[PDB]
Amino acid sequence: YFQSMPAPYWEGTAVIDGEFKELKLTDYRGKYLVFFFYPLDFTFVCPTEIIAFGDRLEEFRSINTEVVACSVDSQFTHLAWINTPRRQGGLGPIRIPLLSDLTHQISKDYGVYLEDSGHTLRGLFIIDDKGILRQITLNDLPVGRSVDETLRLVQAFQYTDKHGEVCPAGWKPGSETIIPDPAGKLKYFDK
Amino acid sequence: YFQSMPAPYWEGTAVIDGEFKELKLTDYRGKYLVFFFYPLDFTFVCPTEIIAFGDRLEEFRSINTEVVACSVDSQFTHLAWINTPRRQGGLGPIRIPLLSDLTHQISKDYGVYLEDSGHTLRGLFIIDDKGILRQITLNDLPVGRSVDETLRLVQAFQYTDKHGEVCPAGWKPGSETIIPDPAGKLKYFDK
Amino acid sequence: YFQSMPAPYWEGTAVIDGEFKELKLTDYRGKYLVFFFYPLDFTFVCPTEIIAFGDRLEEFRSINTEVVACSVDSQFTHLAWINTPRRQGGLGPIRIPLLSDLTHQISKDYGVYLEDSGHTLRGLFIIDDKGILRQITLNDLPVGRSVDETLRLVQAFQYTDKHGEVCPAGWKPGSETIIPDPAGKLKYFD
Amino acid sequence: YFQSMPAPYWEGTAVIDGEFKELKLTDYRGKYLVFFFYPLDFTFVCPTEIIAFGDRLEEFRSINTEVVACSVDSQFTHLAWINTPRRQGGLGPIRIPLLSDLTHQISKDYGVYLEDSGHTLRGLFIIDDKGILRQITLNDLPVGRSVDETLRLVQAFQYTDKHGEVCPAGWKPGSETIIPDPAGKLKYFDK
Amino acid sequence: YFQSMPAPYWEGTAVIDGEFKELKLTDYRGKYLVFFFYPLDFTFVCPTEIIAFGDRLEEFRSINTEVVACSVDSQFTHLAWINTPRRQGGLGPIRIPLLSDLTHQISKDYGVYLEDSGHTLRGLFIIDDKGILRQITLNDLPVGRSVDETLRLVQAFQYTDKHGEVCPAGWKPGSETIIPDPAGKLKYFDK
Amino acid sequence: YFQSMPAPYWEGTAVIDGEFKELKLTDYRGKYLVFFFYPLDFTFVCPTEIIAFGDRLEEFRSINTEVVACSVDSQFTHLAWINTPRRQGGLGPIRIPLLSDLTHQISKDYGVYLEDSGHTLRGLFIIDDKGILRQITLNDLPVGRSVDETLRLVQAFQYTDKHGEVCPAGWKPGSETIIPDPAGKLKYFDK
Amino acid sequence: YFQSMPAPYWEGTAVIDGEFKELKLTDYRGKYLVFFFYPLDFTFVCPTEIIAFGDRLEEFRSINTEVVACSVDSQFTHLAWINTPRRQGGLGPIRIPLLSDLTHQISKDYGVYLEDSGHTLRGLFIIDDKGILRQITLNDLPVGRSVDETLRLVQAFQYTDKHGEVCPAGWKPGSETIIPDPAGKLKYFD
Amino acid sequence: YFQSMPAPYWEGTAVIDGEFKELKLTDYRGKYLVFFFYPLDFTFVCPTEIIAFGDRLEEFRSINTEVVACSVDSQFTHLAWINTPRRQGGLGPIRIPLLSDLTHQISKDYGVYLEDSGHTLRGLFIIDDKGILRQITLNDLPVGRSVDETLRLVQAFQYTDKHGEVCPAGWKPGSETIIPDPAGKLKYFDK
Amino acid sequence: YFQSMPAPYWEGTAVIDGEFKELKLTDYRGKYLVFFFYPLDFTFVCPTEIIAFGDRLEEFRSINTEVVACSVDSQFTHLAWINTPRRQGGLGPIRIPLLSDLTHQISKDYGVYLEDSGHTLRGLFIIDDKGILRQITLNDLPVGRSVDETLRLVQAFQYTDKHGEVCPAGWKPGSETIIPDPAGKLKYFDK
Amino acid sequence: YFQSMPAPYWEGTAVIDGEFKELKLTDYRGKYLVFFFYPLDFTFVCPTEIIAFGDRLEEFRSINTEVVACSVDSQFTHLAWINTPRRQGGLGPIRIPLLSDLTHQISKDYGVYLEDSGHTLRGLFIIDDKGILRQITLNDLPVGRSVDETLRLVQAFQYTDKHGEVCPAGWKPGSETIIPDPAGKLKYFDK
């Protein structure tokens, strides 16, 4: 492991506004990307995460951030799942691309593929506008991720990108930051 | 990668209530453990994270969860930092053990060692009472982690361990859960 | 390659009468098994093949033969597809097991996994009651297989198993067979 | 294995109209080819297959499809077998080339060579006009193949080559086909 | 390459008195065996050699020697060739076994397989009653072997086996032999 | 093994007309060559073979065929043996070159060297005018070769080279030959 | 090992005059360098050695020699330690660079890294103005090195560099030297 | 490398009081040993080192420490050198064993052998009573080592062995030591 | 290479008093043995060396020393050479065994085989009664060895075996010897 | 190994006329060189050999031959030994170079280094004016070599170089030589 590792390249077929479209990581150059894998279409926590991000999508897009979801399921299954009502555990209409990883290459490239299970864990990745990986969140299967936390992290990374100050534990917009220098730091710590 | 993989074993010297003590992962068997690495003593975000957890430690201990912090610094340096006032970027008295990983073996075993830097990234691990790794959170250097989110995750893993239902995106105590069955799931969805 | 080789072992989660059940190749010992792979749930030729076998299942069961279908899709997707009406390209309720091969291990063991696509081709295998592979039919994706030809082949293998005569090109029940001896063959040829 | 694999190249001596001639797979480019191996000259199912295709050869050649048979036997044996009356288990005059694979190279290249037996199984290959393998049929020794089914498959591959449609289970000329699109498929399925 | 090496074991299906039988090299222990390969059934020199040996078989049997012929052709082709009249280049009925080597293992074990041709050269082997290889004669394709020379060699080997004298160039029964000692040799030479 | 294999190249010191001369296989291009190995100078069968060929040398030279003998003995030993009277088991004057293979390289190249004994078996090779190996005759130690059979083989190979018909079993000059074609063969077989 | 081996190259972050600066071995070309590793900041023998050399730096600088100290600790820790009073086991302000070897590459390149402990032993290296290693002194952890012996060695190497006579056991400035010739040596011995 | 490494074992022929005797490292267990290599007999700095230690040997023996010198020279050369007067660059009688390392194995085991020169550098090793290596001093060829400094080190190691306190820079007997504890160290530092 | 190398074991066929006998190195245990190789029978220096030792054989046997000669020639060639008069460059009757090394294994084991030539150089070996190699003399081809020098060496080795003194340059029986001790040597050198 | 092998190159420091000089094998091109190794300075047989050759150096120089001696001892020990009286086991008066092989490279290149002892055996090499090794004499440690024998060999090699006749066993100047031809040899033998 090294600092400022580029996110691994991916490309594949996604369902975007009900259509099959080719999609690649570099389509998101210039924007932050929340790229997240979920285990399996037609399961349990997975739709709740896709819906949680989808229903709050503008809170990301308004800060130059896009969201893409990915599983090992086919694009046909993705579409069938979109075409399933929420009340039956479907997604209904969704504005987040659903990337298909049938070959498992994308999941393996991101280190999130479970060899025993044939699908991914709940792996979420925050990739900056330069394609550099900034954050990795990996959850075991029974526990969903947090849109609140993902937003906070995106906010924090964008802030430190712009200002060069660093973000303390629990930082949210408006919170104090630190000048990352042995002298400069005392402005924060003495305060 | 497989599911329900054990957290790698570790042992080393920790500073615990101002004294050097031997500490090992298995000391926490039967308890949840938040095990987190931070880059470096006498730096910037790191003290804020140790303090953030330390000052809320009873919120964890009261739910059968302990917290351990680790860096590549020596135990002598850990103790010197504890003995540095908070207003100077020190820790002050701290109730969380500070584990020393001078050899880098613990860091490398957890995949958080930065070869180019000679220290870790901000890697946090939630390990259950059986020693199984449940959650991994890796932040790049300039952005601190969240105690709130860490608590929510411990709560959720504990809840799913006890009930067998699964936790939707953003779950907190009191929130609805899902019966992970194609029929049972509809109690959640079909509202 | 050698003659009379065992069908590779497989086991996995299948949807059977709307429930998830573990299924094994060895569960079919004592019976012929038509074991076929299809590319993908919620596609085009695939449901027509599954439905064709399913709706004609008694033509197999009446001759001690079972049918199992398999794709790389999850068991959750299989059940979703069964729960999709036929008029929407679903399966509807179905009496043949749908085996899930999420890991791809079964498909690769049968040599039908397409590395570039992430799913199988249209590979059908006829396995006898002793677990020996008797017939392999591999179709490219746009052309479906034939239940009628599959039945003919099952009938032909069962017949040659029982009688030890051999079945000419295009043999169907009632057709002439050959005694596989340089002398006996002449009854057929002459 | 991959989507659209070229049929392996072959070349060798064939008996064509009672003469020894060099024959190459590439001689058939521009036309579909039914290329089939049979175990052994002077045996039992084998002549019935050669004769079945031969006597119906114009049903193939009239749809731009040629037919070639191959075994491990020598060209001298092929000729002797052609010169044996059908009533003695010979072929009589035959319009299908009989390719000789004495070295076993062709049979091994097609994966139909039986190491324990020294001859092929009953392996039939449908190769399109571009030299791409479209269909493989492999029978164990005691059961002959079907000219009817071979014709159906050639017809179906030619049809799908020409049209933006796919052929359901059991398709024959005149049968309904499917537009391989999530929306267009419903023209078929709605019935 | 060493002195008094055993003939390589072989076993396979032979045509014997018009039937298929399993035949093994070890079936001939206790007797000399002339074991010869010929290129191909239904060819030219080959039938002349098989017939020359078969028609003179008693010249071998009367001196405790058997004859077996082998090619890469199948047992079915061997029998078809036996059932072909001599006037048509057939064998007619034959009293020497015709061994089949479809797999080529026997030919390769005897070093007579031609990789480029897929059949043997004209390789003849004289094997003694103890299974030891005594003589190897390899002819290129256009020139047949000699039954008379084969008989001379068998006689010579049998004579030297019995008497421990050695056989000069061109020895035939009745010819002078040599006592293989520096002193005893002069009985032969010194006149 | 392949058809029409070149005889391995050799060169070395030979005794020619009582003198040491360097001799090379390529010196015999344009002629057939009977190149034969014999075990050892001053032994038993060996002189009989060298003398048998030497005394009939013109029967070979008359038909554009030369003869060369070879053993592992030195050229000095060869000369001593030539200078030894025939009545003492010597050669007397000899018109066939005696090639020396002290290093064993030529013997090994011809596959006739016996590792246990340190000399060759009785290996004879018929090599055509293009240096192509036509016939190999290997006898175990106690039994001499035949000048008659060697002559017959040279005649047969020269005949088939010239006429492109093939030589049946036991062919001698004046004997019937075969046209190696399925139709042309019947001229011979019909008798 | 061979005669006249160059000191392994090193570069890294050092604390110099209270600030972080990149420092390289080649910055010292043209001068002798006493380059020494110590186990750990905030420990026991270590500050005594750093202080002993630092406080006597002019005894080196006045003979074209510089001194650099190195441990596996970070530069932030080095600076904290400099900012700790001597009476608390700190360094106080200091005039010799403290090089950080967080990655352990420098320590490993010098053969002084202890794999079991995660820090160096007490390894001191005398490097000449051409970058050639002249002297290696390795102490186990509980015993500190000597500034006075180090000065003696630097003085001796400079003297032999200049004069081409050699320095007997215990040589100090003013002591007798030897002409390294079988005949010339007798001026010393006899 | 690791802490508390044993000195590598050695054995060889030494000159001890004018006689050749086998000497082993294990002969010195129970006592400290100053074991030093010197380049070459009959050279320049080398005798001054042997003599410096030899003439002050009682300062070591009286603190339970022995001294052994070693070079690559033979025992015969060692003895010749001992028998050379000091005024001619010899040793005269010497009470320190001179170990011979003709094979270079001992020198190589200690990492002091110069491959280009065929002798050692000036390598000195302080080995404790348990055979553990405590100190290594390696000098380039033109500069002799120090008896004063060697005694200081032996004294310091013996002191820290007995008392568990540690020895500051420049420690000599009578000097202040440090308690190696974060609290106890202040007894030293406060002064 | 080490002190007291055993002579490599050998066994082979030798000519001994005109008969072929198996001879082994171990047959000479308890006696010194002069074991020498010579290039080739029927050559030039070689017979002079065999004759020179043979004619003085009693000078060796009188001091419990045997002599054996070896070349790569066959035992038959050796006997022919014995049976050749000395006036023709033969040996005549000889009392030294002539060992044959047809396979070259003995020569190669003794490191005297010339790969380019197919025979040995002039290598002589003095082997003691315990089978240990004491002396090796290797001459290039044009120069013979010395019986005088060989006797001197055998005498010298026997003397030093018996007395444990050592033999100066040019020692012959009756010459001064040296006590191999730094003190004892002076008895010799003081004169 | 092969005929006319060049002597391995060597270079190193030698004591020549009491001074250290670099010496190289190639310095002796155009002259014969007797190059000999001896075990060790200050020992027993060694000085007797060095003295025996050195004192008779003109018997070599007058026939265009030089002498060089070599051991593993240093040049300093070589000089010390030269500077030691003969009556004390020293060399004294010497005029042949004493080459030092401290690294053992020369000894190893000549195959005379003893791994167990750390010095050479008594290996003497006669190298001709073209640098070709002509003679190797290897003695075990207790037995010195012969100046007289070495002179005989040098004389013989020079004679054969010049005349192209070969030198019988025991040849000395004035002795009969042999013309190395099967005919010419009889001038010597046939008397």
Swiss-Prot record, chains C, G:
<dbReference type="GO" id="GO:0008379">
    <property type="term" value="F:thioredoxin peroxidase activity"/>
</dbReference>
<dbReference type="GO" id="GO:0005783">
    <property type="term" value="C:endoplasmic reticulum"/>
</dbReference>
<comment type="function">
    <text>Thiol-specific peroxidase that catalyzes the reduction of hydrogen peroxide and organic hydroperoxides to water and alcohols, respectively. Plays a role in cell protection against oxidative stress by detoxifying peroxides and as sensor of hydrogen peroxide-mediated signaling events. Regulates the activation of NF-kappa-B in the cytosol by a modulation of I-kappa-B-alpha phosphorylation.</text>
</comment>
<keyword id="KW-0575">Peroxidase</keyword>
<dbReference type="GO" id="GO:0051604">
    <property type="term" value="P:protein maturation"/>
</dbReference>
<dbReference type="GO" id="GO:0008584">
    <property type="term" value="P:male gonad development"/>
</dbReference>
<protein>
    <recommendedName>
        <fullName>Peroxiredoxin-4</fullName>
        <ecNumber>1.11.1.24</ecNumber>
    </recommendedName>
</protein>
<dbReference type="GO" id="GO:0140313">
    <property type="term" value="F:molecular sequestering activity"/>
</dbReference>
<dbReference type="GO" id="GO:0005576">
    <property type="term" value="C:extracellular region"/>
</dbReference>
<dbReference type="GO" id="GO:0007283">
    <property type="term" value="P:spermatogenesis"/>
</dbReference>
<dbReference type="GO" id="GO:1904813">
    <property type="term" value="C:ficolin-1-rich granule lumen"/>
</dbReference>
<keyword id="KW-0732">Signal</keyword>
<dbReference type="GO" id="GO:0007252">
    <property type="term" value="P:I-kappaB phosphorylation"/>
</dbReference>
<dbReference type="GO" id="GO:0060090">
    <property type="term" value="F:molecular adaptor activity"/>
</dbReference>
<comment type="subunit">
    <text>Homodimer; disulfide-linked, upon oxidation. 5 homodimers assemble to form a ring-like decamer. Can form heterodimers with PRDX1.</text>
</comment>
<keyword id="KW-0676">Redox-active center</keyword>
<dbReference type="GO" id="GO:0005634">
    <property type="term" value="C:nucleus"/>
</dbReference>
<dbReference type="GO" id="GO:2000255">
    <property type="term" value="P:negative regulation of male germ cell proliferation"/>
</dbReference>
<keyword id="KW-1015">Disulfide bond</keyword>
<dbReference type="GO" id="GO:0042744">
    <property type="term" value="P:hydrogen peroxide catabolic process"/>
</dbReference>
<keyword id="KW-0560">Oxidoreductase</keyword>
<dbReference type="GO" id="GO:0045454">
    <property type="term" value="P:cell redox homeostasis"/>
</dbReference>
<dbReference type="GO" id="GO:0042802">
    <property type="term" value="F:identical protein binding"/>
</dbReference>
<keyword id="KW-0256">Endoplasmic reticulum</keyword>
<dbReference type="GO" id="GO:0034774">
    <property type="term" value="C:secretory granule lumen"/>
</dbReference>
<feature type="domain" description="Thioredoxin">
    <location>
        <begin position="6"/>
        <end position="159"/>
    </location>
</feature>
<keyword id="KW-0049">Antioxidant</keyword>
<dbReference type="GO" id="GO:0005829">
    <property type="term" value="C:cytosol"/>
</dbReference>
<dbReference type="GO" id="GO:0070062">
    <property type="term" value="C:extracellular exosome"/>
</dbReference>
<dbReference type="GO" id="GO:0030198">
    <property type="term" value="P:extracellular matrix organization"/>
</dbReference>
<feature type="active site" description="Cysteine sulfenic acid (-SOH) intermediate">
    <location>
        <position position="46"/>
    </location>
</feature>
<comment type="similarity">
    <text>Belongs to the peroxiredoxin family. AhpC/Prx1 subfamily.</text>
</comment>
<keyword id="KW-0963">Cytoplasm</keyword>
<dbReference type="GO" id="GO:0006979">
    <property type="term" value="P:response to oxidative stress"/>
</dbReference>
